[PDB]
Structures are given as structure tokens and as C-alpha cells.
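Build the 3D complex.
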Amino acid sequence: PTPGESYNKNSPINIAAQNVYTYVRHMNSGHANYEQADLMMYLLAMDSLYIFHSYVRKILAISK
Amino acid sequence: DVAWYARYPHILEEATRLPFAYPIGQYYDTGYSVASATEWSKYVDTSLTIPGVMCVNFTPTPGESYNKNSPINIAAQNVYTYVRHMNSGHANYEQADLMMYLLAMDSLYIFHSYVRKILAISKLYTPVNKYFPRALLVALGVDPEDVFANQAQWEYFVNMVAYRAGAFAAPASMTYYERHAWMSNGLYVDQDVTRAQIYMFKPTMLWKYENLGTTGTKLVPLMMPKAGDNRKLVDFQVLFNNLVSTMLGDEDFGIMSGDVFKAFGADGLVKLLAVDSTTMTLPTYDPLILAQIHSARAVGAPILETSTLTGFPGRQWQITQNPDVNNGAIIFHPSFGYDGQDHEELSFRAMCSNMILNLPGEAHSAEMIIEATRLATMFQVKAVPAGDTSKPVLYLPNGFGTEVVNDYTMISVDKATPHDLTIHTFFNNILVPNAKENYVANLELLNNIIQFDWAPQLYLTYGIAQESFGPFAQLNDWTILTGETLARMHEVCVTSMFDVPQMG
Amino acid sequence: PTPGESYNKNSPINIAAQNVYTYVRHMNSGHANYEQADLMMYLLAMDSLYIFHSYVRKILAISK
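Done.
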């Protein structure tokens, strides 16, 4: 699983990090202790967790 | 009235059956009425070339700003106390950061309107105007054949500009954006006819954001393609890709855009028109914009960091904001009268008289007078040169609108073969040196200019006469306009453009 | 057979070349290994082919 190619801040996932950070920051008003990139790398680690769950769930569901 | 014509109507019918409505965009040879007159070669002008395109080359300005009491600093205070009182929290920016963001948004929107007009011109065809669409594409600076050959990539690029710049928020209640979109997304005829002549507005330069970190922010010029440059899609991609390079995945820009989105809702934002391979703009008749073209008043080329101005160091055009300079205010006082060289273009001396506000009819409403003077910019003093030696002469205005005119570009057809497009760039002021070839060339330019109806008023200086001649324009109900009156009108219109209806 | 007189881009043959290349290439998703002048030269060579056919079938039909 890739985030796409990213050479600088003008990349699609940095633009998506800006978009999802200004979405999340404007519902959770307060003193955030993280940036755009912390939130997007959290959202990318969530994908590896979900793919791992789908992987072991397919291991179980194949065996029947 | 004549009783003979009613007796022989077929004679009057067949004798006066002439082919009218000649298509413009072509060279026409009138021929000779005296067959022997070919012995008098250039003394008989058998040539006829009607122009089609006059492109007004503008620069978007915030108004004149010397201190914090300026209209855009007051507007920065107003929009900052509006945005700050809907987005309660810990803001990490000032008034001036937000207003320079709102000024960079305008250059993005004008760039999108520019490339969208490049696409929407390329589908224009009329069999009676041969200037459609290649002359309008040459006047915008693009290679016309590159837009026809690479149509789908041009459409993808324009849709991607509208999708990337459309991710940011800018308030639609600020009429700055609507005025610039009305100028930039517009093809305007001078007369409401079929073989009319076309006015366009094209940005000479755009304002490029650069964050100076601790030392503030800056808006630096980014020059656009001039007419006859044959620029390809890769050049406009490079222009867009350093226009939004500091902005497109940025933290602070996203925070300011989200704050503007929460303050002014989704219905109160500046919308970008998209293209769908059928988007076609049509030349409309708008006498409000023709009044501004008539009273338009060119200020010269923009001064850049690379420009050589002997005796004028540090005179480049920039919207600067330093917290250690002028109490942290947005500062913009550009120096005018520069034409791109170091030779004292002394046609600009003709702009030192007071202007004539020419305007049609007999009744002139307040909105008409305040709208017709928008591209008018009168010099007030000379700029003081730093040093005993000074090659150019620069000027300081008494204020200016949200746009200044830098140039005009005329597109006509060449009278020599082949009859390709001729590109002529001029100010309101035109120097005619003492040479044999440029007197009839100045006659060519003058007769080309008077084909356009509410054209800018010209000033013509001569080399050996050592004198300028005044407003070369057909007058109407006119008035003589002074610098303090135009300064008051400029103050009113810079205030009205940046006004946001507030809650506080 | 002539395509008309042509010395610049405002010729009727060049306007026709652009107008038919937009329809074949862009409006119908054609291939990108030729320009508009190649398409119009092809469209002009087809005319000489058809004029040859009309010529020899007139030779055929006259002889009876």
C-alpha cells in the first residue's frame, strides 16, 4: 500500500493532509498538539492495521 | 422627396446594389481609380487594414498604501475582526497575514480566469471576423496551435487549476474578486455589431506569495506572457507551479482558508467556473467597461528586482509587510513611468497635464463617474533619484484603483504579403522620433486606434517639434479632472472593493 | 483540383484542417501521431483518387 509519489509539499497526500487537518481542526476546537502530517501519518498507519485485520480475517474465512 | 426615383425604381435598385459587410481580419486592396498612378508608387495608398483586438494589459493593485491608515490596512482590520469573531480560538496570524492571503487568492483567481479564457477563446469562429480565434490567442501570449493540438491536456490543466485554487476560501462579499473576474472573464465589443472590434483584459504580472518567516510576508511580481510570445502549456504549468508552490500543501494557508470558510459560509465564497469542452464565452456589449477603457491611463512597465534603473535603487514593485517597518502595515507605493530601459522615455512628460474625463450623453450618474475613472491614474510628483546621475524619470501618483494599466496591445493584419498578424504595444503616450519610417507608422497606429470606439485617449510627442500634442480622442460631454478629485474617487473605490459586510 | 489559395493560417484549407482535426482527434479520441496538416493532405489525396475513378468510369460509359 502506497500513499502515492511524494517529493515535496505540493504532493496529493500533503494536499490531502491539509484538507483533512482543516476539517478535523474545525470540528475539534481547542489546543491541538499535532500538525497536518502527524494526522495523515496516523491515517496511513490505520490503513496498515485495517489491511492486517482483513488479511487474518481472510485466513480464517478461507479455511471453511 | 424625389419623384423620379418613384417612376424608375428598378434603375435605383440595380444601380446601388453594392456588396457590404466585408469580413475583418483580411488585407483589402482598393485598386486604382487612375490607372496611370502606379508611377507614383507610395503616393497612392491602395491598402486597407482594419484591426480587431485591443488588449488592455493590467496589474492588480491593492491601492496605494503608505502607512496603517490606508484603505487596505483598514480593510485588513475589518476582515480580521470578522474572521476572528467567528473562529474563536488561538489564531496564529495577524491582520496582515490574512489580508496578504486574500491578495494572493486574487492572483490565483485571475490566473484561472486567464487560462480559462485561453481555452474558451479557441472555440470561437465567425466567418465575418477572421481574427477569431488566433488573434485573441496571440494577444494573450499563447501559441494558438499548441492549444488546438493539445486540447485535452489544456482542459485538464485548467480543470486542475480550478480544483487546486478552489480548495482555498475567499469571501464572495468582497467585490475585489468579482471585479477582477468581470474584467478577466470577458470579451467586449466596442460597438454592438457583428464585425466589431474586441477589447480584452490580460494581467501583465501577478502577485506571487513568499513567506519571509520572522521578517513578515511579501507579494513579488510574477510576469505573464506578453503578446506574440508563443508560450506553450508547459510554460503556463511552470507559472502555476511556482504561483501555488508555497501554498498548495501548506499548514498556515490551510488554517487561514479554514478560518475564512468558517467565517464566510460555503454560499459566501468565490466560485470558479469550470470547463467541459463546450465552454464558450461570447463577445458582449458592456458600455460600463468601455467607459473605463476610454479613461484608462497607462502607468508603464512593472519594476522588478532585476530591472536596471540608473539612479533609482530599490524601486521594485512589491506588496511588503514587515513588522519592524511602518508598524507592521501592508505597504505598496509603486513608482510609475518605467518602460523597460534606461533612456528617459520622454513621452511620459505628456501625462503631466490634467486628464479629461470623456463620457457620453448629457446625464452622468454618480456610479457612472465612479466607474469610468477606475483605470485612470494621474502622476503627481517626480520620484527623487538616489544620486546625481539618473537615466530615467519616474513618477509618483496620487493613488490608483484596484488595477493599473501597464500597456495596450493592438492586433491587426499586415499590409505587406503575407498578411500575418501585427502586434503593436503602446502606452497612452507615444513617442515619434525623427525618422522617415515612423511618421507613416504612427499614422497607421493612429488610424488603427480610431477604429476602436471608446479607445484610450492618446498623447503624441515628436522628436524635432519637441512638443507633445494633447488628448487625441473624439470628445463628448467632458470635464477636466484634477489629482485631488481622482484621489478621492480612488479612495472611495479601494474602500468599496475590499468592504466586507460585518458582524464584528 | 485546388484546395483554394493558401499562404497563411487564415486560409479556408487551414481553417478546415483545424475544424476536421478537432472532430477526428479530440471529439472522437483519435491517435496522436499526426497533425492537422497531415489529416488535410490525406483528405486532399482522397479527392484525386475519387476524381480518377470518375474519370475512368466516364471513359467506360462513353464508349457505349
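Residues 36-62 of chain A form the longest helix (27 residues).
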